[PDB]
Structures are given as C-alpha cells and as structure tokens.
Design an enzyme around this catalytic site. Sequence first.
Site: not given
Lengths: 528, 533
Positions: B83, B119, B199-200, B329, B332, B434, B442
């Site tokens: 990310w 975010g 997304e998000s 969701e 994470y 993970w 998520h």
Amino acid sequence: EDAELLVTVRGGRLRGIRLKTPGGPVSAFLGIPFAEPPMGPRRFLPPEPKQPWSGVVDATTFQSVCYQYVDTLYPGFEGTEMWNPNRELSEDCLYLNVWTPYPRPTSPTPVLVWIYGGGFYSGASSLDVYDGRFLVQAERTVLVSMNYRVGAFGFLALPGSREAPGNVGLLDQRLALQWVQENVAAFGGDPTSVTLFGESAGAASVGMHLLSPPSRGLFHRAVLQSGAPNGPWATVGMGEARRRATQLAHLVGCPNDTELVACLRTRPAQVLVNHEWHVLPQESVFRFSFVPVVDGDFLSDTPEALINAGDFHGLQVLVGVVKDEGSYFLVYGAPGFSKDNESLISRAEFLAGVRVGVPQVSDLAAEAVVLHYTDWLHPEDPARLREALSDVVGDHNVVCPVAQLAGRLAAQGARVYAYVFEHRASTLSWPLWMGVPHGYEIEFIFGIPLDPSRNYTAEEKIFAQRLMRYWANFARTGDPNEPPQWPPYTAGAQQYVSLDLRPLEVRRGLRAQACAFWNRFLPKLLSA
Amino acid sequence: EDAELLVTVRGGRLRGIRLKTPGGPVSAFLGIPFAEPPMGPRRFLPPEPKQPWSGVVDATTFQSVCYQYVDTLYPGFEGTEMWNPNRELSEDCLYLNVWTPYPRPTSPTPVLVWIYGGGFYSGASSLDVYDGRFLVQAERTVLVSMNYRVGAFGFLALPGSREAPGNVGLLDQRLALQWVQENVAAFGGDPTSVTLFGESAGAASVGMHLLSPPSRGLFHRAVLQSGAPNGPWATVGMGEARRRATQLAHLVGCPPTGGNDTELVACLRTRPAQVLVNHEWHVLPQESVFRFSFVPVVDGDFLSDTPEALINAGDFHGLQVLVGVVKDEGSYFLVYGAPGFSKDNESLISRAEFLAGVRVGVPQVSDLAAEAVVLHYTDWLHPEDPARLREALSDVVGDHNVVCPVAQLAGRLAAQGARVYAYVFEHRASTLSWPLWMGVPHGYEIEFIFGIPLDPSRNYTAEEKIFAQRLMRYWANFARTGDPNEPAPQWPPYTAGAQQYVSLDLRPLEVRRGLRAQACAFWNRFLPKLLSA
Ligand SMILES: *[C@@H]1O[C@H](CO[C@@H]2O[C@@H](C)[C@@H](O)[C@@H](O)[C@@H]2O)[C@@H](O[C@@H]2O[C@H](CO)[C@@H](O)[C@H](O)[C@H]2NC(C)=O)[C@H](O)[C@H]1NC(C)=O
Ligand SMILES: *[C@@H]1O[C@H](CO[C@@H]2O[C@@H](C)[C@@H](O)[C@@H](O)[C@@H]2O)[C@@H](O[C@@H]2O[C@H](CO)[C@@H](O)[C@H](O)[C@H]2NC(C)=O)[C@H](O)[C@H]1NC(C)=O
Ligand SMILES: *[C@@H]1O[C@H](CO[C@@H]2O[C@@H](C)[C@@H](O)[C@@H](O)[C@@H]2O)[C@@H](O[C@@H]2O[C@H](CO)[C@@H](O)[C@H](O)[C@H]2NC(C)=O)[C@H](O)[C@H]1NC(C)=O
Ligand SMILES: NC(=O)c1cc[n+](COC[n+]2ccccc2/C=N/O)cc1
Ligand SMILES: NC(=O)c1cc[n+](COC[n+]2ccccc2/C=N\O)cc1
Ligand SMILES: *[C@@H]1O[C@H](CO)[C@@H](O)[C@H](O)[C@H]1NC(C)=O
Ligand SMILES: *[P@](C)(=O)/N=C(\C)N(CC)CC
Ligand SMILES: *[P@](C)(=O)/N=C(\C)N(CC)CC
C-alpha cells in the site's frame, strides 16, 4: 366427634373438616380469622391482630374474598373465570387456611405458605387452583394460605399520613406469617421451616418479604414463580402513589389527607373498585393502579437497590417462568389480539402495541425496544410480530426481572434454582398460539391433575407428582433434587432446567441477550 | 515511430508504450498531465487545467506519488508495503494513466475510471495492485486512473477561505473526469459509457461524485467497493475542519493561532511538505482507528448537504450501481491501535481490552452510545470469550465504518430508482501475508478485480486465476450494460426489501439476504437517534 378436627390456637378453639383425596384423607381448617375485620374506620389501616374469642370458630368452609375487580372480558370462559372470585366479596376478608395430613402430624412438619397473585388488585386463597389438599397428602407438608387486601383497600397510599400509610395488604401477609409462627405448631407444622411461595404479584410479595427485615425472620426459604419484586409493575413511587390516591378521591366524589381518607371511608367498597383502574396514567397492559409503595418503611429503598446491596448467604430460592409469559396479557389491550383468532397483527399494530406494552417511556426508549424485537429481514411478518410483542411484554415484565433477581442473589451468596415451565396442559382452553401462558404452572404444582374429576392424562398426573416432589424437596432441604440433576443457577453459567413431560434438560441463560437490554442498557437510557 | 503509441489530446501530442500482458499487447499512456502542478503558491488551491504544450509528451511511466505519509508499523512486510508509495513523493503529482487495447479500438468502447483509496491521506494510481493492463487485455475496455492530492494538500480546509477552500483533492478527481470526457475518445473510449469505480476512500469519493451535480454529468455508472460517502470517516464538518487546519498550522509555526486565513495559508505554504505530513495526525482529537485528519468537508459547495441527507433526497432513476464489502472488513484496522492486537499473535483479547477497543473503534461518542455498542456486540452467554471478543471488535469496526454505510447507501439508492447489485467478497487469497484470524481483510478483493493473479511472476493458484477472470467479467459486464450477469446462476438486484446479494469466492454464486441487517439496523436506525438525545 373427631378430635383430629379440633385445634386450639392462641385466639381460641377451631373446628375443621376432613377432605378426600385419591391418596387419602386430609385435615383442613378453612376461614381461620387472623385479623380484626378491616372495616369502617379500619379501612386502609394496618391490620390489627384478631382478638381472642370464646366458643368454637367454624373452620369448615372458605371465608369471603376481599373486594376486587371481576373480569368480564370472556364471560363464562374457563380461562378467565378460574381467576375470578368464587366466594362473596367482603371487606371482612382477613382469613387464612391450614391444610394438614390426616391424622394431624405428631412430629414437626415443614410448612409451605402460599401468597396468591392477581396484580395486587385481585386474587383469593379459595380458588380451585390453590387447593392445598393434594400437596399435603402427597408430600406430607402443612400448607397455609391467607387472604390479603388488594386494590385500593390494600395499597392505596397517602405517603406520610397515618390514616392511609400504604402497603397494608403486605402487612396483612406479614401478620399471617406471624400467625404461622405462633400457631402452626398446633397443627403439627414446624415454625422453624416455613417456605414462602407465590406466583406473579404473589411472587413479588415473597420477594418484598425477603427485602423487608421485619418479615425476614418469619420464613426460611422462598419460591418466586413468574414474578419478582423488582418488576416495572410491582412497586410505585411516593409521588405517583399520592397522585393516584388523590385522583381516586376525585373520581368517587371526594372531598388535608385526614379529610380525604375520611371521605373515602364513607364510600361503598364497590364504588372504589369501579374506579380504581381509571387512575392509571396511560393505556397499558401489565400495569396496576394500587401496588406496594417505596416510602422507606416496609421497603427502605427500591427492590433493585436492596437487591444489589444485599448479602444473601444462607438463602435458598427457587425461581422460574412459564415458556410464554406475555401472550396472556396481550388479549387485554393490545390491538389486533383476541383468543378467538390467530392474532396475526400488522406492523402498525405491533408498533402501537409496543407503546401499550412499555407505557410511560420516552420515544427514544420505545424505539430501542422496537429495534431489538424487530427481525430486520422479516420486519412485517404477522406471525413473527405476534410472537415478538408477546416477547416484549413477557421479557419486560417477568422473565428479565426474574433473571436479574436470580443473577444478583446467586452472585451475592444465595443458592438459586431456576426453571422454565414448558408443558401445555391437555385441558388448556386458550388458543394454541399463546403457548404455555402465564399462571398455568400453578395447577400442576398444586397437584390439581390428580383430581379424578378432571381430564388430565396419566403422564400429566405423573408430571404433577414430579413437580410436587421438586417443590416439597426444596421446602424440606433447600435443594429440589432427589437425594438428571437440577444444577443451581449462577451469574456465569446461567443454568436452568425445563419442566415438561420429558426428563430434566439443563439449558443456559434466561434470555440473556434480551434481558441484557432490559436489565443493563435500558436503565441507563432512561437516566439520560 | 509506432502510430498506435501516438495520440493527440487537447493539450498536445502524447507518446505511450506498448505493454506485454499474458494475453497480448496493451497500449499504456502513463503519467499524462491533466492539471498544472499544485506547487508553491498553488498549494491548497483547486487544480488548474493543464495548459497546452508543443511537441510530444512522453507518457511512458508512472509519475510521482502525491506527498503523503508512509506506513512504518511492519517494515518490509508485504501486507503493508504493498500500500506504500512505489514512486518518489512530490507535490507535482497531478497525472493520469490510460490503458487501451492494442491496436486501439475503432468503434467506441466503454471506459472504467479507477479512484484509489487510502483514507484521503495516502494512495497512488501507480501501485502494482491497480495495474490496468490485465482488465484491458481480458475484457476490452479503456481503463483510466488518476492521482489526486491527499492529506492536508488535498483536504486541509479553512471553509470560506479563498486560499484553502478544501476538497481540492476531489476537484483533482473531477478535473480528471472532465479530462476523460474531452479526450478518451482519442484513445477509442466511449465518453457516453463511463463507469466510476474505487475502493475504500476511493469508493467514498465515487459516491461524492454521485451526490455532487457538477460531477454527475461526467459518468454513467458507479462501483463502490468497501466504502461509501456516508461513513463516519469520509466527511467532516466545517468547524472541525477549521479546528484541525488551525492546529496543524499552529503546530508548524503559523502564524508566528488562527487569525487571518490568507496570511495563515501563506505561512503554511512556506513550510516543507514533509513537515506538514509529520504533524497531520496530531490534530485528531482522540485515540482512534479508521479516522483521518483531512477528509472531504461538507461546506455546501461540492456537497450542498451531508451525504446522508443528499442520499435521502436523491432521485436516482436511470442509475446502475455495484456495491460490496469483504468478509472481514474490520480486522485490518485493529492492529493499528486496538489494545492487545497484533498481526504476529492471535490477538485473543481480554474483555477489558474489548471495552477499551470499543472506545478506540467508536471515538467521540457519549458513554451511553458506547454502552449501546457493547450491548449489541457482547454475547451475554459468553461475555469474556477471547476469540469471540476478537471477532466482535472487528465486527464493530467493520459494521460501523464500511458494511452498514454501504448497506444504507445500497438500500436508499434501490428504493429511489437505482438498479443496485451487491456482493460480499469471501475468498482469502493463497498469497495472503496477514494471519488467519484476520479472515478476508479490507482491501484484498482489489487484486482479483484488476486481474493481478494472471501475472506469471506471482504465485497464485490456477483456480484463483479463473476466479480473477470471472470477477473481471462481472465488473466489465456491469460497465458495458449496467448488469454484471453474462448475456450460470444469476445475480439478482439488491432491493431494500429482499436485500439480496451474492457471495464471491471459488464456488459458484450463492444468493443471500441482508448485509448484516440486524447489526446495521442498530447503526443506521437507532444510534443516530441516541446521539441526538
Ligand atoms: C382478530 O380479532 C381481533 C379482535 O376482534 C374481535 O374478535 C373477533 C374474533 C371478532 O369477534 C370481532 O368482532 C371482535 O372485535 C381483531 O382486532 C380488531 O380488529 C378490528 C377490525 O376488524 C378493529 O376495529 C379493532 O380495533 C381490533 N381490536 C381492538 C380491540 O382494537 C383482529 O383484526 C382480527 N384479526 C384477524 C381476523 O385476522
Ligand atoms: C487579511 O489579510 C489579507 C492579506 O493581507 C496582505 O498581506 C499581509 C501580509 C500584509 O502585507 C497586508 O498589508 C496585505 O494587505 C487581506 O487581503 C488584502 O487586503 C488589502 C486591503 O483590502 C488589499 O489591498 C490587498 O490587495 C489584499 N491582498 C490579497 C487579497 O492578497 C485581507 O483583506 C485581510 N482580511 C481581513 C483583515 O479580514
Ligand atoms: C499480543 O501482542 C500484542 C502486541 O505486542 C507486540 O507483538 C508481540 C508478538 C511482540 O512482538 C511484542 O514485542 C510486540 O509489542 C500485545 O500487546 C502488547 O503487550 C505488551 C505486554 O503486555 C504491552 O506492554 C503493550 O502495551 C501491548 N500493546 C498493545 C498495542 O496493546 C498483547 O499483549 C499480546 N497478546 C498475547 C501475547 O496474547
Ligand atoms: N500524517 C501522519 O502522520 C499519519 C499518521 C498515521 N496515519 C495512519 O497510519 C496508520 N494506519 C492505520 C491503519 C491502516 C493503515 C495505516 C498506515 N497507512 O499508511 C496516517 C497519517
Ligand atoms: N386495578 C387495575 O389496575 C386493574 C387492572 C386490570 N384489570 C383488568 O383488566 C386487565 N386484565 C384483564 C384480564 C386479565 C389480565 C388483566 C391485566 N392484568 O392482569 C382491572 C383492574
Ligand atoms: C372433561 O372435564 C369436563 C369437566 O368435568 C367435562 O365436562 C368433560 O365432559 C370432560 N371431557 C369430555 C370430552 O367429556
Ligand atoms: P400477576 C400479573 O399478579 N398474575 C395474574 C394477573 N394472574 C391472573 C391471570 C395469575 C394469578
Ligand atoms: P480506506 C479506509 O481508504 N482504505 C485503506 C486505508 N486501504 C489501505 C489498506 C485500502 C486501500
């Protein structure tokens, strides 16, 4: 004559009657006066002990039922008539009954004391369903039941006044409990092993004796069936008690607390009864106008306050509920409901019924109830709505109050046993959708199925003897088990057993999810 | 020269590259300038359109990542580095990318426009997991992605100011959509068939374009994955935006508190970008997760009202929407603050840690509201079970921030004219880094939407490759026709009553009912009324 049927109590001599049961004779002493008749200037006052008499008091038949409302919703219907008075009504009504094995026991015998329910506005120890002949024959106990004043006669309160102090119906019960301590030995009963048991408002009164120190020294164990002192219906605050008593006076044409009660005492008893239901603030179910009042005397604080602050080591209680505690109350004010159809209500009727079932709460509080009892994948299904509103009334008024009492007492020293009564009698007149309604475990605990004049099955008879043995085992030892075990209820495991025709099954939690809402969250919401 | 690699847009001529894919050549034009660089005096300002150039612009590689925070929690760990920025940081970052079949289509073909999440403080169109070559090759569409300013650079707002009006990162997106409309036809794309999908935070932004009229004329269909504009995290009020902007300025020297907006922004403009980034999270008022310092503000301009209100008053007839969420969701987000959580142990928390995490998960609410959350997510028969508490807290974070916001949007849009499809993505990738307790976390459906498993250098199973081809076909079918069903179990429209959605994993489609209907009724229907009283 029969020397077994003559007893001398502290007040004088009594003559009882011999009664038949399918298991043998029983001695019964019915209509024993334990208080001076609370009439005229004695209306609303605490009971006075019965003065001694000469001669022999006739104790062979039931005495009068205390003045009370008579239900007229389904006239002649057995489901309703079985709770209606079966003797004439009178303010002269403070009499208790003693059942005893025949011949009367020679050794001290454990004592069961029954307090009837009826929303504190009705009830009678003379109803067919409270007949003690089967329990004392099958289980060799002494059974005592008393009449106490109901409605305004027992619980009209002008708090602070001595002419109408309140809780005198509760004081009637305590006086009968004092009568048992002084007199039950003369019938063969053991005054050092008195077990209180009651249902609905009767179960609430049992709890209030648990929380009133003057009564606590008069018994040793308690059974609370489908009722608890910490309900939303069992107590009322001083200010609301004063408002209801004042509105009753205005409704019957009266009139200073002295001048107000003096005027109420001039009124025929039927007049007050005819108006008692119309002082309630809201249209509602499971709400009664004249109930015990929290004035710091009989109960020094609210039942929940006393329950949380109490040391309860050395106490054993048996508590429980029927499978469908709410269904019975819905045909008395919930729209869309009647025993003569399926009562498959609309969502609008459901929402309307939630205001009726949870009266005098804020819109936000009512909406919190609707959120919990709506299935949001089937929000409008009539059958689910019917069963959800019955869950609302039942959980809010019986199951969750019972669950809080059981959990608090258990965690604070008491040994608790919990049951859910899940058997639907073959004789039941109510429609099938009501399930196992409120009140209909009593006939089995008293052994009414053993009456050969009724059409209970052979397994219901065996079931009744199972229940009578559980109850009597608890009276004798504080443990209902025969020495599939019935484990004690605790705050952690939340264990209870189901009572029906199959053997004991142990389950967990008395609707822990739904009662977390009523017992944990909803109080905080009303504070803000 | 290769004629397929040369295109003339309004600004001038571009030169792209020819990408090799597992299925054949694709023409890519990466790093196309669409706005003037928002530098110096242009910091915090709306984007101005790119002025025309002479000569050929080499659009042959991704341009820089908009200046942003870089995660350091698990350094070197693929689950988080994937990310993180994969290009240099720079405020000069307003570039977009166009993928198109090789050779270019001669009749118009539908366009998918990607908006990354992060975010509103992070993200880049250059991340490997947003590579458009696979979608374009497999489904024959034009894929467009853009960069937009994030963090204070994108969303610091002093409402009413001229020097920092806020929402400039959204205006970066709108400008790119305007670019698509005027220029995609030169790449063979159809400007009358444009499907937004993100997304998000990208999904939240897509929704804000649905609800802002000036953007609504620039696309025709929307896909919202694991995000929605009505979340508690995707917007902020004017006064709170002012409070955060003012404290950020105060923390970095400006002014030598508040006062005059032009003088305050002028001072902020003299501060290095890294200094601003290094103080962004100090302005959040409480310890929290799933909360971000600088996000779209509701100032009556870009959004004339809150997304909740706009969704309620909207007439959405003639609109097709595809929405969905992953299976888990909220997991994470728990390893970034929730007490007792780690990706390196099983995070079997205590009840005290559960109660403490609820405050972190639902910050800035009354104690009563927090008790309500604890009521609905406690199992009062197993109130202290560590594994149940770990899953309950992840449900709190997920339902509150993603699942229920998406569900409320899906239901209101369905009831007010739109044809809605809904999914739950339920496949945990074999390559996932993970731990197992996090489930399908998520953001991990994206790689399958973009066809990443078809990259031979990756180590996905064969079945996961067929799964990727199935989802790409769903997404492309929806882009072409507004219906993901191939013209095979059918995918029914989501409705407020039936509430039907489908599960996406290696098994065939399974229709289900209700996007956590019981939980979401608490979040969408009850708690709003508790917070007002
Ligand atoms: C089922 O019946 C109830 C109650 O209706 C009563 O009982 C019926 C069997 C019949 O004898 C009626 O004449 C009685 O009134 C219904 O609830 C009532 O419905 C009426 C409209 O029909 C309405 O005006 C009343 O307000 C309702 N009850 C009250 C006390 O308000 C119910 O609708 C019936 N449901 C069915 C038939 O499915
Ligand atoms: C708030 O301040 C701005 C900017 O003030 C200018 O810059 C300062 C550092 C200082 O040099 C001041 O003297 C400058 O005016 C004001 O905007 C200016 O306002 C004046 C007077 O109306 C005008 O002549 C300038 O052109 C404006 N400069 C711009 C627009 O950049 C603004 O009016 C002030 N607002 C207040 C005090 O509320
Ligand atoms: C599980 O781990 C968390 C986080 O600890 C980190 O991961 C561990 C595997 C190890 O690498 C530690 O060095 C890491 O810090 C634990 O939560 C922390 O626990 C410590 C010790 O009690 C405490 O001082 C910290 O404040 C905690 N941090 C947070 C964010 O709560 C947690 O206790 C572990 N639980 C287990 C092992 O069951
Ligand atoms: N500008 C900042 O200092 C800052 C600090 C922390 N965060 C939030 O990062 C923590 N985090 C929390 C949850 C998920 C991801 C991440 C990291 N992403 O890069 C953003 C900005
Ligand atoms: N004094 C009263 O409050 C009162 C309450 C209820 N009723 C009878 O109507 C209600 N009702 C009628 C039949 C059966 C039950 C019930 C309610 N609670 O038991 C009369 C007087
Ligand atoms: C059941 O008992 C009642 C009351 O005694 C009686 O009238 C009835 O006849 C009995 N059952 C039947 C079906 O006869
Ligand atoms: P509770 C509410 O005191 N019980 C009632 C009203 N009964 C009559 C149906 C049972 C005695
Ligand atoms: P949203 C909260 O914008 N999404 C985030 C933070 N992701 C980072 C893993 C998914 C792109």
